[PDB]
Amino acid sequence: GPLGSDQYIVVNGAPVIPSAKVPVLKKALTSLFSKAGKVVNMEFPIDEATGKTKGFLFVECGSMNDAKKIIKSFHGKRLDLKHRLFLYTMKDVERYNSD
């Protein structure tokens, strides 16, 4: 994305659902994460064959500090009784792709 590398987060462990349901999940996760920091955009990779989410997503935050606060608040926490989320800064993954 076009913002600073350390403003992006990868979230793992989210629901695997028909992607018809992404807008609902997106607003739910955006609403939750917004309690800790500013979310600018959120994107869910989809398995083309099944049309399902893959269970991870990439989040663009309003600043490095917003990303850090989101990771701190949500990393390792249960989303519900079936899912637990794991959040990391995306910078090294971005650079592994581009270095």
Residue numbers in the entry: 71 to 169
Can you provide the manuscript's text about this entry?
One of its large subunits, eIF3b, serves as a scaffold within eIF3 as it interacts with several other subunits. Here, by using X-ray crystallography we studied the structure of yeast eIF3b-RRM and showed that it corresponds to the canonical RNA recognition motif.
Two different truncations of the N-terminal domain of yeast eIF3b were designed based on homology to the published structure of its human ortholog. Highly reproducible crystals were obtained in space group P212121 with two molecules per asymmetric unit which diffracted to 1.25 Å. Crystallographic phases were obtained by molecular replacement using the structure of the sex-lethal RRM domain as search model. The last β-strand is followed by a short α-helix which connects this domain to the rest of the protein. The two yeast eIF3b76–170 monomers occupying the asymmetric unit are related by a two-fold non-crystallographic symmetry axis, forming a closely packed dimer. Interestingly, comparison of the dimer of eIF3b-RRM with hnRNP A1 (UP1) shows that Tyr 158, Asp 162 and Phe166 of one monomer interact with the RNP1 motif of the second monomer in the crystal, mimicking the presence of the oligonucleotide. Comparison of the relative orientation of the monomers between eIF3b-RRM76–170 and eIF3b-RRM76–161 showed that chain B in eIF3b-RRM76–161 has been displaced by ∼9 Å relative to the same chain in eIF3b-RRM76–170. Therefore this dimer is most probably an artifact of the crystallization and not the functional unit of the protein in the solution.
